[PDB]
Amino acid sequence: MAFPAGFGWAAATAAYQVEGGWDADGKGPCVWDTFTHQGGERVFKNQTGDVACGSYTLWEEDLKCIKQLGLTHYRFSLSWSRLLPDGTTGFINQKGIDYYNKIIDDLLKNGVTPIVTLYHFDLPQTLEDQGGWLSEAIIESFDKYAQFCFSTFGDRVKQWITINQANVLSVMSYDLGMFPPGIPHFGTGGYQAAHNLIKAHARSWHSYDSLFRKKQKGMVSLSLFAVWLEPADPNSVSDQEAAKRAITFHLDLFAKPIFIDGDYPEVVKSQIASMSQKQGYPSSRLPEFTEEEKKMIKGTADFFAVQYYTTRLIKYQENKKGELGILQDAEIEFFPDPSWKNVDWIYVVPWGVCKLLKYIKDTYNNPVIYITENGFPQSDPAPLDDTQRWEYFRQTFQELFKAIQLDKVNLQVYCAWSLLDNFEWNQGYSSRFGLFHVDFEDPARPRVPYTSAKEYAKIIRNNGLE
Numbered sequence: 001m002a003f004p005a006g007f008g009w010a011a012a013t014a015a016y017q018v019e020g021g022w023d024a025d026g027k028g029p030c031v032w033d034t035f036t037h038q039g040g041e042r043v044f045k046n047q048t049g050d051v052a053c054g055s056y057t058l059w060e061e062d063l064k065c066i067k068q069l070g071l072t073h074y075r076f077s078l079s080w081s082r083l084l085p086d087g088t089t090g091f092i093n094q095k096g097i098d099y100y101n102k103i104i105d106d107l108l109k110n111g112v113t114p115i116v117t118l119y120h121f122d123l124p125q126t127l128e129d130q131g132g133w134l135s136e137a138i139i140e141s142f143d144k145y146a147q148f149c150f151s152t153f154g155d156r157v158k159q160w161i162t163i164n165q166a167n168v169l170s171v172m173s174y175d176l177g178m179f180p181p182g183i184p185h186f187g188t189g190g191y192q193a194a195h196n197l198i199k200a201h202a203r204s205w206h207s208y209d210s211l212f213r214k215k216q217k218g219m220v221s222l223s224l225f226a227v228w229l230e231p232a233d234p235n236s237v238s239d240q241e242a243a244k245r246a247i248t249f250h251l252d253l254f255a256k257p258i259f260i261d262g263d264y265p266e267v268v269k270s271q272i273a274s275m276s277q278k279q280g281y282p283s284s285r286l287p288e289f290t291e292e293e294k295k296m297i298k299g300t301a302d303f304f305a306v307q308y309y310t311t312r313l314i315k316y317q318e319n320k321k322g323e324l325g326i327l328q329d330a331e332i333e334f335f336p337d338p339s340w341k342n343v344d345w346i347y348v349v350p351w352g353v354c355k356l357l358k359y360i361k362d363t364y365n366n367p368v369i370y371i372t373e374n375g376f377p378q379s380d381p382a383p384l385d386d387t388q389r390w391e392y393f394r395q396t397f398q399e400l401f402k403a404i405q406l407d408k409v410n411l412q413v414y415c416a417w418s419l420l421d422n423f424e425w426n427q428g429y430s431s432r433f434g435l436f437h438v439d440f441e442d443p444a445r446p447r448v449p450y451t452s453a454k455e456y457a458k459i460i461r462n463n464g465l466e
Protein backbone atom coordinates (compact mmCIF):
# COMPACT_ATOMS: atom_id res chain seq x y z
CA MET A 1 0.00 0.00 0.00
CA ALA A 2 2.10 2.92 -1.34
CA PHE A 3 0.40 6.32 -0.97
CA PRO A 4 0.60 9.11 -3.68
CA ALA A 5 3.99 10.69 -4.02
CA GLY A 6 3.74 13.98 -2.10
CA PHE A 7 1.01 12.66 0.23
CA GLY A 8 0.86 14.82 3.40
CA TRP A 9 1.50 13.10 6.75
CA ALA A 10 0.67 15.36 9.64
CA ALA A 11 -0.15 15.53 13.33
CA ALA A 12 -2.32 18.20 15.04
CA THR A 13 -2.69 20.22 18.20
CA ALA A 14 -4.91 23.18 19.19
CA ALA A 15 -3.90 26.18 21.21
CA TYR A 16 -6.07 25.77 24.33
CA GLN A 17 -5.33 21.99 24.44
CA VAL A 18 -1.52 22.25 24.46
CA GLU A 19 -0.19 25.74 25.11
CA GLY A 20 -0.61 26.65 28.75
CA GLY A 21 0.59 30.14 29.41
CA TRP A 22 -3.11 31.04 29.67
CA ASP A 23 -2.27 34.53 30.99
CA ALA A 24 1.40 34.73 30.00
CA ASP A 25 2.83 37.87 28.36
CA GLY A 26 -0.46 39.84 28.36
CA LYS A 27 -2.63 37.13 26.79
CA GLY A 28 -6.36 37.82 27.21
CA PRO A 29 -8.71 35.25 28.72
CA CYS A 30 -10.56 32.88 26.37
CA VAL A 31 -13.88 31.22 27.16
CA TRP A 32 -12.10 28.04 28.30
CA ASP A 33 -10.04 29.94 30.88
CA THR A 34 -13.32 31.32 32.29
CA PHE A 35 -15.14 27.95 31.95
CA THR A 36 -12.46 25.78 33.56
CA HIS A 37 -11.70 28.23 36.39
CA GLN A 38 -15.38 28.20 37.34
CA GLY A 39 -15.19 24.46 38.11
CA GLY A 40 -18.32 22.70 39.34
CA GLU A 41 -17.29 19.42 37.74
CA ARG A 42 -17.98 20.47 34.10
CA VAL A 43 -14.48 19.17 33.35
CA PHE A 44 -12.93 15.91 34.67
CA LYS A 45 -11.60 16.60 38.19
CA ASN A 46 -12.16 20.33 37.57
CA GLN A 47 -8.96 20.26 35.42
CA THR A 48 -7.86 23.27 33.29
CA GLY A 49 -5.57 24.21 30.37
CA ASP A 50 -3.65 26.67 32.55
CA VAL A 51 -0.53 24.72 31.80
CA ALA A 52 -1.59 21.71 29.67
CA CYS A 53 1.43 20.46 27.69
CA GLY A 54 3.26 23.76 28.31
CA SER A 55 3.74 24.19 24.52
CA TYR A 56 3.82 27.99 24.88
CA THR A 57 7.00 27.39 26.89
CA LEU A 58 8.12 24.16 25.31
CA TRP A 59 7.70 24.65 21.53
CA GLU A 60 11.28 23.40 21.02
CA GLU A 61 10.18 20.05 22.58
CA ASP A 62 7.21 19.90 20.17
CA LEU A 63 9.54 20.58 17.24
CA LYS A 64 11.74 17.64 18.35
CA CYS A 65 8.60 15.44 18.35
CA ILE A 66 7.59 16.71 14.92
CA LYS A 67 11.14 16.10 13.60
CA GLN A 68 11.31 12.56 15.09
CA LEU A 69 8.01 11.70 13.39
CA GLY A 70 9.21 13.22 10.07
CA LEU A 71 5.86 14.95 9.50
CA THR A 72 5.49 16.67 6.16
CA HIS A 73 2.80 19.06 7.65
CA TYR A 74 1.91 20.17 11.13
CA ARG A 75 -1.51 21.50 12.12
CA PHE A 76 -1.79 23.86 15.05
CA SER A 77 -4.07 26.70 15.94
CA LEU A 78 -3.53 30.37 16.77
CA SER A 79 -4.90 31.64 20.04
CA TRP A 80 -7.13 34.59 19.16
CA SER A 81 -6.97 35.83 22.78
CA ARG A 82 -3.16 35.39 22.86
CA LEU A 83 -2.71 37.56 19.70
CA LEU A 84 -5.54 40.04 20.40
CA PRO A 85 -6.29 40.06 24.16
CA ASP A 86 -9.62 41.85 23.74
CA GLY A 87 -10.40 40.14 20.38
CA THR A 88 -9.46 43.27 18.34
CA THR A 89 -6.38 44.83 16.85
CA GLY A 90 -6.79 47.84 19.23
CA PHE A 91 -4.06 46.06 21.18
CA ILE A 92 -1.77 43.47 19.62
CA ASN A 93 0.38 41.15 21.72
CA GLN A 94 3.73 41.06 19.95
CA LYS A 95 4.89 38.18 22.16
CA GLY A 96 1.94 36.21 20.77
CA ILE A 97 3.02 37.06 17.21
CA ASP A 98 6.63 36.21 17.98
CA TYR A 99 5.63 32.80 19.41
CA TYR A 100 3.63 31.84 16.27
CA ASN A 101 6.32 33.23 13.93
CA LYS A 102 8.92 31.07 15.70
CA ILE A 103 6.71 27.91 15.13
CA ILE A 104 6.19 28.87 11.47
CA ASP A 105 9.87 29.71 10.87
CA ASP A 106 11.08 26.55 12.69
CA LEU A 107 8.63 24.43 10.66
CA LEU A 108 9.69 25.82 7.33
CA LYS A 109 13.45 25.56 8.06
CA ASN A 110 12.78 21.87 8.84
CA GLY A 111 10.78 21.27 5.67
CA VAL A 112 7.47 20.92 7.47
CA THR A 113 4.46 22.72 6.01
CA PRO A 114 2.21 24.62 8.48
CA ILE A 115 -1.54 24.15 8.35
CA VAL A 116 -2.96 26.89 10.53
CA THR A 117 -6.31 27.06 12.23
CA LEU A 118 -7.42 30.57 13.13
CA TYR A 119 -10.01 29.66 15.71
CA HIS A 120 -10.39 26.37 17.60
CA PHE A 121 -13.28 26.45 20.11
CA ASP A 122 -11.53 29.24 22.04
CA LEU A 123 -13.22 32.63 21.71
CA PRO A 124 -11.78 35.61 23.51
CA GLN A 125 -13.88 36.05 26.63
CA THR A 126 -14.56 39.72 25.67
CA LEU A 127 -16.29 38.63 22.41
CA GLU A 128 -18.28 35.91 24.21
CA ASP A 129 -19.45 38.66 26.64
CA GLN A 130 -20.57 40.50 23.47
CA GLY A 131 -22.90 37.62 22.56
CA GLY A 132 -20.25 35.31 20.98
CA TRP A 133 -21.61 33.39 17.95
CA LEU A 134 -25.26 34.24 18.86
CA SER A 135 -24.74 37.88 17.81
CA GLU A 136 -24.16 39.31 14.31
CA ALA A 137 -21.26 41.41 15.67
CA ILE A 138 -19.02 38.36 15.69
CA ILE A 139 -18.86 38.22 11.87
CA GLU A 140 -16.88 41.45 11.57
CA SER A 141 -14.83 40.69 14.68
CA PHE A 142 -13.80 37.33 13.11
CA ASP A 143 -13.20 38.79 9.65
CA LYS A 144 -10.83 41.42 11.05
CA TYR A 145 -9.07 38.74 13.13
CA ALA A 146 -8.65 36.54 10.00
CA GLN A 147 -7.26 39.54 8.02
CA PHE A 148 -4.80 40.27 10.83
CA CYS A 149 -3.62 36.62 10.77
CA PHE A 150 -3.36 36.52 6.94
CA SER A 151 -1.41 39.79 6.99
CA THR A 152 0.88 38.70 9.85
CA PHE A 153 1.65 35.08 8.88
CA GLY A 154 0.31 34.59 5.34
CA ASP A 155 3.69 35.34 3.74
CA ARG A 156 4.76 31.87 4.98
CA VAL A 157 1.41 30.07 5.67
CA LYS A 158 -0.49 28.90 2.60
CA GLN A 159 -2.98 26.47 4.22
CA TRP A 160 -5.60 27.81 6.55
CA ILE A 161 -8.58 26.44 8.51
CA THR A 162 -10.67 29.50 9.53
CA ILE A 163 -12.87 27.69 12.04
CA ASN A 164 -12.31 24.30 13.63
CA GLN A 165 -15.41 22.07 13.45
CA ALA A 166 -18.02 24.86 13.33
CA ASN A 167 -20.69 22.20 13.43
CA VAL A 168 -19.50 20.77 16.81
CA LEU A 169 -18.82 24.23 18.14
CA SER A 170 -22.39 25.43 17.38
CA VAL A 171 -23.93 22.35 19.10
CA MET A 172 -21.59 22.08 22.10
CA SER A 173 -21.25 25.78 22.89
CA TYR A 174 -24.72 27.10 22.04
CA ASP A 175 -27.21 24.25 21.79
CA LEU A 176 -26.20 21.76 24.49
CA GLY A 177 -24.12 24.24 26.42
CA MET A 178 -21.56 21.60 27.30
CA PHE A 179 -18.75 23.89 26.11
CA PRO A 180 -18.43 27.52 27.16
CA PRO A 181 -20.45 29.58 27.60
CA GLY A 182 -22.37 26.61 29.02
CA ILE A 183 -26.06 27.58 28.57
CA PRO A 184 -28.44 25.12 26.91
CA HIS A 185 -30.67 26.52 24.15
CA PHE A 186 -31.90 23.24 22.81
CA GLY A 187 -33.07 23.51 19.23
CA THR A 188 -32.31 27.28 18.87
CA GLY A 189 -28.79 28.31 19.90
CA GLY A 190 -27.06 25.79 17.63
CA TYR A 191 -28.78 27.08 14.47
CA GLN A 192 -28.35 30.74 15.46
CA ALA A 193 -24.60 30.15 16.07
CA ALA A 194 -24.26 28.07 12.86
CA HIS A 195 -25.73 30.91 10.81
CA ASN A 196 -23.09 33.35 12.09
CA LEU A 197 -20.25 30.78 11.86
CA ILE A 198 -21.09 30.12 8.21
CA LYS A 199 -21.25 33.84 7.43
CA ALA A 200 -18.05 34.70 9.39
CA HIS A 201 -16.21 31.93 7.54
CA ALA A 202 -17.47 33.16 4.12
CA ARG A 203 -16.54 36.79 4.84
CA SER A 204 -13.06 35.70 5.97
CA TRP A 205 -12.69 33.66 2.74
CA HIS A 206 -13.59 36.72 0.64
CA SER A 207 -11.12 38.76 2.58
CA TYR A 208 -8.40 36.21 1.76
CA ASP A 209 -9.53 35.98 -1.87
CA SER A 210 -9.71 39.76 -2.55
CA LEU A 211 -6.82 40.97 -0.30
CA PHE A 212 -4.32 38.19 0.15
CA ARG A 213 -4.67 35.38 -2.39
CA LYS A 214 -2.91 37.04 -5.38
CA LYS A 215 0.23 37.63 -3.36
CA GLN A 216 0.14 34.69 -0.93
CA LYS A 217 -1.35 32.11 -3.27
CA GLY A 218 -2.64 29.87 -0.47
CA MET A 219 -5.90 28.18 0.30
CA VAL A 220 -8.57 28.54 2.95
CA SER A 221 -11.29 26.24 4.23
CA LEU A 222 -13.06 25.37 7.54
CA SER A 223 -13.11 21.96 9.11
CA LEU A 224 -16.15 19.89 9.91
CA PHE A 225 -16.75 17.07 12.36
CA ALA A 226 -18.18 14.06 10.59
CA VAL A 227 -19.54 10.84 12.06
CA TRP A 228 -20.22 8.26 9.39
CA LEU A 229 -23.79 6.99 9.72
CA GLU A 230 -25.52 3.79 8.78
CA PRO A 231 -29.18 2.77 9.21
CA ALA A 232 -29.69 0.64 12.42
CA ASP A 233 -31.75 -1.82 10.37
CA PRO A 234 -30.18 -2.03 6.90
CA ASN A 235 -33.55 -3.15 5.45
CA SER A 236 -35.65 -0.40 7.03
CA VAL A 237 -36.40 2.38 4.51
CA SER A 238 -37.23 4.86 7.28
CA ASP A 239 -33.83 4.02 8.87
CA GLN A 240 -32.06 4.43 5.47
CA GLU A 241 -33.74 7.80 4.96
CA ALA A 242 -32.97 8.61 8.62
CA ALA A 243 -29.20 7.84 8.30
CA LYS A 244 -29.10 10.00 5.13
CA ARG A 245 -30.93 12.82 6.92
CA ALA A 246 -28.64 12.64 9.97
CA ILE A 247 -25.62 13.11 7.70
CA THR A 248 -27.35 16.00 5.99
CA PHE A 249 -28.12 17.61 9.33
CA HIS A 250 -24.72 17.36 10.96
CA LEU A 251 -22.43 17.68 7.99
CA ASP A 252 -24.15 19.04 4.90
CA LEU A 253 -25.91 21.78 6.91
CA PHE A 254 -22.55 23.59 6.84
CA ALA A 255 -20.90 22.12 3.75
CA LYS A 256 -23.80 22.69 1.27
CA PRO A 257 -24.00 26.51 1.62
CA ILE A 258 -20.19 26.91 1.57
CA PHE A 259 -19.31 24.39 -1.17
CA ILE A 260 -22.51 24.18 -3.32
CA ASP A 261 -25.09 26.98 -3.42
CA GLY A 262 -24.91 29.34 -0.41
CA ASP A 263 -27.99 27.81 1.22
CA TYR A 264 -28.88 25.09 3.74
CA PRO A 265 -30.12 21.61 2.69
CA GLU A 266 -33.78 21.62 1.78
CA VAL A 267 -34.72 18.82 4.23
CA VAL A 268 -32.99 20.78 7.03
CA LYS A 269 -34.99 23.91 6.19
CA SER A 270 -38.28 21.99 5.81
CA GLN A 271 -37.98 19.83 8.97
CA ILE A 272 -37.08 22.77 11.19
CA ALA A 273 -39.65 25.25 9.70
CA SER A 274 -42.42 22.62 9.99
CA MET A 275 -41.45 21.72 13.58
CA SER A 276 -40.98 25.42 14.44
CA GLN A 277 -44.45 26.31 13.14
CA LYS A 278 -46.17 23.56 15.21
CA GLN A 279 -44.20 24.64 18.30
CA GLY A 280 -45.62 28.18 18.02
CA TYR A 281 -42.57 30.11 16.74
CA PRO A 282 -43.38 33.09 14.44
CA SER A 283 -40.17 32.23 12.64
CA SER A 284 -38.33 28.99 11.79
CA ARG A 285 -35.68 28.29 14.48
CA LEU A 286 -33.25 28.01 11.51
CA PRO A 287 -32.24 31.56 10.46
CA GLU A 288 -32.69 32.20 6.67
CA PHE A 289 -29.82 33.34 4.49
CA THR A 290 -30.77 36.43 2.53
CA GLU A 291 -30.24 36.26 -1.22
CA GLU A 292 -27.16 38.42 -0.82
CA GLU A 293 -25.78 36.20 1.94
CA LYS A 294 -26.33 33.06 -0.18
CA LYS A 295 -24.34 34.77 -2.94
CA MET A 296 -21.46 35.66 -0.54
CA ILE A 297 -21.36 32.20 1.09
CA LYS A 298 -21.45 30.07 -2.05
CA GLY A 299 -18.00 28.77 -3.07
CA THR A 300 -16.03 29.88 -0.03
CA ALA A 301 -13.81 26.79 0.44
CA ASP A 302 -10.66 25.91 -1.43
CA PHE A 303 -10.60 22.32 -0.17
CA PHE A 304 -12.64 20.00 2.05
CA ALA A 305 -11.34 19.71 5.62
CA VAL A 306 -12.91 16.89 7.65
CA GLN A 307 -12.52 15.33 11.08
CA TYR A 308 -13.42 11.68 11.50
CA TYR A 309 -13.22 9.44 14.58
CA THR A 310 -16.17 7.04 14.60
CA THR A 311 -19.50 5.81 13.12
CA ARG A 312 -23.03 5.44 14.54
CA LEU A 313 -26.15 3.57 13.67
CA ILE A 314 -29.23 5.68 13.10
CA LYS A 315 -32.85 4.82 13.67
CA TYR A 316 -35.86 6.95 12.69
CA GLN A 317 -37.58 8.43 15.72
CA GLU A 318 -40.72 10.33 14.84
CA ASN A 319 -41.07 13.57 16.77
CA LYS A 320 -44.75 12.94 17.65
CA LYS A 321 -44.84 15.34 20.60
CA GLY A 322 -43.06 18.22 18.85
CA GLU A 323 -40.18 18.09 21.37
CA LEU A 324 -37.51 20.81 21.09
CA GLY A 325 -34.03 19.94 19.89
CA ILE A 326 -31.79 19.14 16.91
CA LEU A 327 -32.17 15.35 17.24
CA GLN A 328 -35.94 15.85 17.38
CA ASP A 329 -35.79 18.15 14.31
CA ALA A 330 -33.86 15.41 12.48
CA GLU A 331 -36.25 12.77 13.99
CA ILE A 332 -33.46 10.31 14.59
CA GLU A 333 -31.81 8.43 17.38
CA PHE A 334 -28.14 7.30 17.31
CA PHE A 335 -26.31 4.40 19.00
CA PRO A 336 -23.27 2.20 18.54
CA ASP A 337 -23.36 -1.38 17.24
CA PRO A 338 -22.82 -3.33 20.45
CA SER A 339 -20.10 -5.38 18.69
CA TRP A 340 -17.79 -2.33 18.23
CA LYS A 341 -14.77 -1.71 20.48
CA ASN A 342 -14.58 1.82 22.07
CA VAL A 343 -12.55 4.15 24.19
CA ASP A 344 -14.92 6.89 25.43
CA TRP A 345 -17.20 7.91 22.51
CA ILE A 346 -14.64 6.69 19.94
CA TYR A 347 -16.07 3.36 18.72
CA VAL A 348 -13.53 1.77 16.39
CA VAL A 349 -15.09 1.57 12.92
CA PRO A 350 -12.22 2.17 10.47
CA TRP A 351 -14.36 1.55 7.34
CA GLY A 352 -16.46 4.58 8.32
CA VAL A 353 -13.64 6.81 7.11
CA CYS A 354 -13.75 5.18 3.66
CA LYS A 355 -17.52 5.62 3.37
CA LEU A 356 -17.25 9.23 4.56
CA LEU A 357 -14.50 10.05 2.00
CA LYS A 358 -16.48 8.57 -0.87
CA TYR A 359 -19.58 10.52 0.35
CA ILE A 360 -17.49 13.76 0.29
CA LYS A 361 -16.18 12.95 -3.22
CA ASP A 362 -19.74 12.19 -4.49
CA THR A 363 -21.50 15.12 -2.83
CA TYR A 364 -18.91 17.89 -3.07
CA ASN A 365 -17.63 17.48 -6.66
CA ASN A 366 -14.51 15.43 -5.98
CA PRO A 367 -12.71 18.09 -3.89
CA VAL A 368 -9.24 18.09 -2.46
CA ILE A 369 -9.71 16.50 0.96
CA TYR A 370 -7.66 17.03 4.08
CA ILE A 371 -8.38 14.84 7.10
CA THR A 372 -7.51 17.50 9.60
CA GLU A 373 -8.18 15.32 12.71
CA ASN A 374 -8.34 11.58 13.17
CA GLY A 375 -7.11 9.35 15.95
CA PHE A 376 -7.74 7.18 19.01
CA PRO A 377 -7.72 8.00 22.70
CA GLN A 378 -6.37 5.78 25.46
CA SER A 379 -7.72 5.92 29.00
CA ASP A 380 -5.67 5.92 32.18
CA PRO A 381 -3.67 3.72 32.72
CA ALA A 382 -2.22 4.33 29.22
CA PRO A 383 0.56 1.92 28.11
CA LEU A 384 3.48 3.47 26.23
CA ASP A 385 3.59 0.29 24.22
CA ASP A 386 0.14 0.96 22.76
CA THR A 387 0.01 -1.93 20.31
CA GLN A 388 -3.77 -2.23 20.34
CA ARG A 389 -4.24 1.44 19.44
CA TRP A 390 -1.63 1.18 16.71
CA GLU A 391 -3.64 -1.68 15.19
CA TYR A 392 -6.61 0.75 14.99
CA PHE A 393 -4.38 3.28 13.13
CA ARG A 394 -3.18 0.58 10.73
CA GLN A 395 -6.79 -0.43 9.93
CA THR A 396 -7.61 3.24 9.41
CA PHE A 397 -4.63 3.74 7.03
CA GLN A 398 -5.72 0.69 5.00
CA GLU A 399 -9.13 2.32 4.65
CA LEU A 400 -7.54 5.63 3.51
CA PHE A 401 -5.60 3.63 0.95
CA LYS A 402 -8.85 1.99 -0.23
CA ALA A 403 -10.53 5.43 -0.58
CA ILE A 404 -7.64 6.73 -2.68
CA GLN A 405 -6.96 3.59 -4.75
CA LEU A 406 -10.46 2.09 -5.19
CA ASP A 407 -12.74 5.12 -4.84
CA LYS A 408 -10.31 7.67 -6.35
CA VAL A 409 -10.84 10.14 -3.48
CA ASN A 410 -8.48 13.12 -3.66
CA LEU A 411 -7.20 12.81 -0.08
CA GLN A 412 -3.98 14.76 0.08
CA VAL A 413 -3.31 15.23 3.77
CA TYR A 414 -4.00 12.98 6.81
CA CYS A 415 -3.53 14.65 10.19
CA ALA A 416 -3.33 12.56 13.39
CA TRP A 417 -4.97 14.02 16.45
CA SER A 418 -2.73 14.51 18.28
CA LEU A 419 1.01 15.19 18.37
CA LEU A 420 0.67 15.20 22.18
CA ASP A 421 -1.52 13.96 24.99
CA ASN A 422 -3.38 17.08 25.93
CA PHE A 423 -6.48 18.70 27.44
CA GLU A 424 -9.39 16.78 25.89
CA TRP A 425 -11.95 19.48 26.65
CA ASN A 426 -14.53 18.23 29.23
CA GLN A 427 -12.55 14.95 29.58
CA GLY A 428 -9.52 16.97 30.66
CA TYR A 429 -6.32 14.90 30.70
CA SER A 430 -8.16 11.55 31.22
CA SER A 431 -8.33 11.00 27.50
CA ARG A 432 -4.91 10.63 25.81
CA PHE A 433 -4.86 11.06 22.01
CA GLY A 434 -1.13 11.76 21.71
CA LEU A 435 1.48 10.05 19.59
CA PHE A 436 3.71 11.40 22.36
CA HIS A 437 2.91 10.74 26.01
CA VAL A 438 3.05 13.75 28.28
CA ASP A 439 3.39 13.52 32.06
CA PHE A 440 1.11 16.23 33.50
CA GLU A 441 2.32 15.54 37.09
CA ASP A 442 5.86 16.53 36.20
CA PRO A 443 6.41 20.34 35.94
CA ALA A 444 8.76 19.81 32.94
CA ARG A 445 5.85 18.10 31.02
CA PRO A 446 8.28 15.67 29.42
CA ARG A 447 7.26 14.07 26.08
CA VAL A 448 7.91 10.38 25.46
CA PRO A 449 6.81 8.47 22.32
CA TYR A 450 4.13 5.87 22.41
CA THR A 451 4.76 2.88 20.13
CA SER A 452 2.30 4.63 17.72
CA ALA A 453 4.80 7.45 17.27
CA LYS A 454 7.57 5.04 16.24
CA GLU A 455 5.20 3.16 13.96
CA TYR A 456 3.71 6.32 12.39
CA ALA A 457 7.21 7.57 11.63
CA LYS A 458 7.81 4.32 9.65
CA ILE A 459 4.56 4.77 7.67
CA ILE A 460 5.72 8.30 6.87
CA ARG A 461 9.31 7.22 5.93
CA ASN A 462 7.89 4.43 3.72
CA ASN A 463 5.02 6.61 2.48
CA GLY A 464 2.63 3.74 3.15
CA LEU A 465 2.39 0.35 4.76
CA GLU A 466 2.43 -3.44 4.32
Ligand SMILES: CCCCCCCC/C=C/CCCCCCCC(=O)O
Pocket residue numbers: 171227246247249250312326327330332334345
Ligand atom coordinates in the same frame (compact mmCIF):
# COMPACT_ATOMS: atom_id res chain seq x y z
C1 LIG B 1 -20.93 10.76 23.91
C2 LIG B 1 -21.89 11.13 22.78
C3 LIG B 1 -21.40 10.65 21.42
C4 LIG B 1 -20.96 11.80 20.50
C5 LIG B 1 -20.63 11.40 19.06
C6 LIG B 1 -21.81 10.86 18.25
C7 LIG B 1 -22.55 11.96 17.49
C8 LIG B 1 -23.47 11.43 16.39
C9 LIG B 1 -24.27 12.59 15.87
C10 LIG B 1 -24.97 12.55 14.57
C11 LIG B 1 -26.47 12.75 14.50
C12 LIG B 1 -26.80 13.87 13.52
C13 LIG B 1 -28.02 14.69 13.94
C14 LIG B 1 -27.59 16.04 14.54
C15 LIG B 1 -27.80 15.99 16.04
C16 LIG B 1 -27.23 17.15 16.83
C17 LIG B 1 -26.20 16.63 17.84
C18 LIG B 1 -26.79 16.46 19.22
O1 LIG B 1 -27.57 17.32 19.67
O2 LIG B 1 -26.50 15.47 19.93
Ligand SMILES: CCCCCCCCCCCCCCCC(=O)O
Pocket residue numbers: 167168170171172190191194225249250251253326425
Ligand atom coordinates in the same frame (compact mmCIF):
# COMPACT_ATOMS: atom_id res chain seq x y z
C1 LIG C 1 -26.61 23.14 14.53
C2 LIG C 1 -26.19 22.20 13.40
C3 LIG C 1 -26.16 20.74 13.86
C4 LIG C 1 -24.77 20.13 13.68
C5 LIG C 1 -24.60 18.84 14.47
C6 LIG C 1 -23.16 18.30 14.40
C7 LIG C 1 -22.43 18.31 15.75
C8 LIG C 1 -22.83 17.13 16.64
C9 LIG C 1 -21.91 17.00 17.86
C10 LIG C 1 -22.69 16.88 19.17
C11 LIG C 1 -22.26 15.74 20.10
C12 LIG C 1 -20.78 15.37 19.94
C13 LIG C 1 -19.95 15.58 21.21
C14 LIG C 1 -18.47 15.33 20.96
C15 LIG C 1 -17.72 16.59 20.55
C16 LIG C 1 -16.41 16.74 21.30
O1 LIG C 1 -16.33 16.35 22.48
O2 LIG C 1 -15.40 17.27 20.76
Ligand SMILES: *[C@H]1O[C@H](CO)[C@@H](O)[C@H](O)[C@@H]1O
Pocket residue numbers: 014017165168225307373417423424425
Ligand atom coordinates in the same frame (compact mmCIF):
# COMPACT_ATOMS: atom_id res chain seq x y z
C1 LIG D 1 -10.13 18.32 17.38
O1 LIG D 1 -11.48 17.96 17.43
C2 LIG D 1 -11.72 16.66 18.00
C3 LIG D 1 -13.22 16.28 17.84
O2 LIG D 1 -14.01 17.34 18.36
C4 LIG D 1 -11.30 16.63 19.50
O3 LIG D 1 -11.47 15.30 20.06
C5 LIG D 1 -9.87 17.12 19.64
O4 LIG D 1 -9.44 17.25 20.99
C6 LIG D 1 -9.54 18.39 18.81
O5 LIG D 1 -9.87 19.58 19.51
Ligand SMILES: [Cl-]
Pocket residue numbers: 014015016077078079080117118119120121122
Ligand atom coordinates in the same frame (compact mmCIF):
# COMPACT_ATOMS: atom_id res chain seq x y z
CL1 LIG E 1 -7.08 28.45 18.34
Ligand SMILES: [Cl-]
Pocket residue numbers: 225226227307308309310
Ligand atom coordinates in the same frame (compact mmCIF):
# COMPACT_ATOMS: atom_id res chain seq x y z
CL1 LIG F 1 -16.48 13.15 15.26
Ligand SMILES: [Mg+2]
Pocket residue numbers: 164165223224306307372373
Ligand atom coordinates in the same frame (compact mmCIF):
# COMPACT_ATOMS: atom_id res chain seq x y z
MG1 LIG G 1 -10.65 19.17 12.34
